[model samples]
Target: MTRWVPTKREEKYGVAFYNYDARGADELSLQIGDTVHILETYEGWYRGYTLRKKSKKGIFPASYIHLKEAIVEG
Candidate 1:
Protein backbone atom coordinates (compact mmCIF):
# COMPACT_ATOMS: atom_id res chain seq x y z
CA MET A 1 0.00 0.00 0.00
CA THR A 2 1.17 3.54 -0.79
CA ARG A 3 0.64 6.54 1.43
CA TRP A 4 1.51 9.72 -0.49
CA VAL A 5 -0.49 12.72 0.55
CA PRO A 6 1.63 15.58 -0.74
CA THR A 7 1.96 18.52 1.65
CA LYS A 8 2.93 20.74 -1.28
CA ARG A 9 0.57 21.29 -4.17
CA GLU A 10 3.17 22.44 -6.68
CA GLU A 11 5.17 19.29 -6.99
CA LYS A 12 8.04 18.81 -9.40
CA TYR A 13 8.75 15.42 -10.92
CA GLY A 14 12.00 13.76 -11.90
CA VAL A 15 13.86 10.49 -12.51
CA ALA A 16 16.94 9.47 -10.62
CA PHE A 17 20.21 9.71 -12.55
CA TYR A 18 21.98 7.04 -10.55
CA ASN A 19 21.90 5.14 -7.27
CA TYR A 20 22.23 7.48 -4.30
CA ASP A 21 22.81 6.17 -0.79
CA ALA A 22 21.79 8.37 2.07
CA ARG A 23 24.67 9.94 3.91
CA GLY A 24 22.63 10.39 7.08
CA ALA A 25 19.33 9.44 8.61
CA ASP A 26 17.74 12.63 7.34
CA GLU A 27 18.58 11.91 3.72
CA LEU A 28 16.83 9.79 1.12
CA SER A 29 18.34 7.12 -1.07
CA LEU A 30 17.41 6.66 -4.69
CA GLN A 31 18.00 4.24 -7.54
CA ILE A 32 18.44 4.92 -11.23
CA GLY A 33 15.13 5.53 -12.98
CA ASP A 34 13.22 5.91 -9.74
CA THR A 35 10.51 8.55 -9.84
CA VAL A 36 10.83 11.44 -7.41
CA HIS A 37 8.21 13.98 -6.49
CA ILE A 38 10.16 17.07 -5.48
CA LEU A 39 8.55 19.22 -2.84
CA GLU A 40 11.34 21.72 -2.22
CA THR A 41 14.96 22.31 -3.21
CA TYR A 42 17.72 23.16 -0.79
CA GLU A 43 21.28 24.30 -1.48
CA GLY A 44 22.50 20.94 -2.77
CA TRP A 45 19.56 18.62 -2.10
CA TYR A 46 15.89 18.38 -2.81
CA ARG A 47 13.22 17.59 -0.28
CA GLY A 48 10.67 15.16 -1.66
CA TYR A 49 9.12 11.71 -1.72
CA THR A 50 10.36 8.77 -3.71
CA LEU A 51 7.97 6.41 -5.44
CA ARG A 52 10.31 3.40 -5.47
CA LYS A 53 9.95 2.95 -1.72
CA LYS A 54 6.35 4.24 -1.71
CA SER A 55 6.53 6.04 1.64
CA LYS A 56 10.07 7.36 1.91
CA LYS A 57 10.54 11.10 2.21
CA GLY A 58 13.77 13.01 2.78
CA ILE A 59 16.50 15.07 1.20
CA PHE A 60 18.34 13.83 -1.88
CA PRO A 61 21.04 15.42 -4.02
CA ALA A 62 19.52 17.72 -6.60
CA SER A 63 22.05 16.54 -9.14
CA TYR A 64 21.00 12.94 -8.63
CA ILE A 65 17.95 13.39 -10.80
CA HIS A 66 16.92 14.83 -14.12
CA LEU A 67 13.72 16.82 -14.16
CA LYS A 68 10.79 14.93 -15.70
CA GLU A 69 7.82 16.32 -17.50
CA ALA A 70 4.49 14.68 -18.24
CA ILE A 71 3.44 14.18 -21.83
CA VAL A 72 0.38 12.95 -23.67
CA GLU A 73 0.43 10.69 -26.69
CA GLY A 74 -2.54 11.65 -28.68
Candidate 2:
Protein backbone atom coordinates (compact mmCIF):
# COMPACT_ATOMS: atom_id res chain seq x y z
CA MET A 1 0.00 0.00 0.00
CA THR A 2 1.15 3.53 -0.80
CA ARG A 3 0.28 6.84 0.77
CA TRP A 4 -0.74 9.81 -1.31
CA VAL A 5 1.74 12.66 -1.54
CA PRO A 6 0.17 15.92 -0.57
CA THR A 7 0.70 18.94 -2.77
CA LYS A 8 3.65 21.08 -1.80
CA ARG A 9 1.47 24.07 -1.09
CA GLU A 10 -0.72 22.04 1.23
CA GLU A 11 2.10 20.44 3.15
CA LYS A 12 3.03 21.64 6.62
CA TYR A 13 6.53 21.61 8.10
CA GLY A 14 8.19 21.16 11.47
CA VAL A 15 11.49 20.79 13.26
CA ALA A 16 12.24 17.94 15.62
CA PHE A 17 13.22 18.95 19.14
CA TYR A 18 13.75 15.40 20.48
CA ASN A 19 15.26 12.21 19.15
CA TYR A 20 12.78 9.54 18.22
CA ASP A 21 13.36 6.08 16.77
CA ALA A 22 11.13 3.93 14.68
CA ARG A 23 9.63 1.10 16.71
CA GLY A 24 8.08 -0.70 13.73
CA ALA A 25 7.57 -0.56 9.99
CA ASP A 26 5.18 2.37 10.01
CA GLU A 27 7.19 4.83 12.09
CA LEU A 28 9.96 7.29 11.22
CA SER A 29 13.27 7.70 12.99
CA LEU A 30 14.00 11.28 13.90
CA GLN A 31 16.96 13.17 15.26
CA ILE A 32 16.98 16.56 16.90
CA GLY A 33 16.87 19.54 14.50
CA ASP A 34 15.66 17.47 11.55
CA THR A 35 13.11 19.22 9.39
CA VAL A 36 9.97 17.24 8.75
CA HIS A 37 7.63 17.76 5.82
CA ILE A 38 4.28 16.95 7.27
CA LEU A 39 1.78 15.08 5.10
CA GLU A 40 -0.97 14.13 7.53
CA THR A 41 -1.93 14.26 11.17
CA TYR A 42 -3.49 11.79 13.59
CA GLU A 43 -3.84 11.39 17.31
CA GLY A 44 -0.40 11.61 18.91
CA TRP A 45 1.33 11.13 15.52
CA TYR A 46 2.08 12.74 12.22
CA ARG A 47 2.91 11.28 8.81
CA GLY A 48 5.86 13.03 7.16
CA TYR A 49 9.31 12.82 5.60
CA THR A 50 12.58 13.99 7.08
CA LEU A 51 14.66 16.51 5.17
CA ARG A 52 17.75 14.66 6.36
CA LYS A 53 16.60 11.58 4.43
CA LYS A 54 14.49 12.89 1.59
CA SER A 55 13.22 9.51 0.47
CA LYS A 56 12.16 8.19 3.84
CA LYS A 57 8.55 8.61 4.91
CA GLY A 58 6.64 7.42 7.98
CA ILE A 59 4.77 8.43 11.10
CA PHE A 60 6.44 10.14 14.04
CA PRO A 61 5.25 11.16 17.48
CA ALA A 62 3.66 14.62 17.35
CA SER A 63 5.17 15.66 20.65
CA TYR A 64 8.71 15.37 19.34
CA ILE A 65 8.43 18.30 16.98
CA HIS A 66 7.39 21.93 16.88
CA LEU A 67 5.41 22.93 13.83
CA LYS A 68 6.79 25.84 11.83
CA GLU A 69 3.43 27.54 11.91
CA ALA A 70 3.29 27.27 15.66
CA ILE A 71 6.48 29.20 16.21
CA VAL A 72 5.98 32.63 17.62
CA GLU A 73 8.14 35.61 16.75
CA GLY A 74 10.41 36.64 19.54
Tell me, by TM-score, which candidate is best: 2
TM-score of each: 0.65, 0.68
lDDT of 1 by residue, 1-74 (tens): 74543434443677777777887768887787678878776446667787666577787776666776743469
- RMSD in order of candidates: 6.9, 5.1
* Runs with alpha carbons beyond 4 Å of true place in candidate 2: 1-11, 69-74
List candidate 1 segments past 4 Å from native.
1-11, 71-74
**Model 1 local distance difference test score:** 0.70
What local lDDT does model 1 show for residue 57? 79
lDDT of each: 0.70, 0.74
By TM-score, how accurate is candidate 1? 0.65
Clashing pairs in 2: none
lDDT of 2 by residue, 1-74 (tens): 75544435443688887778888768888888778888886556678788767788898777776777634548
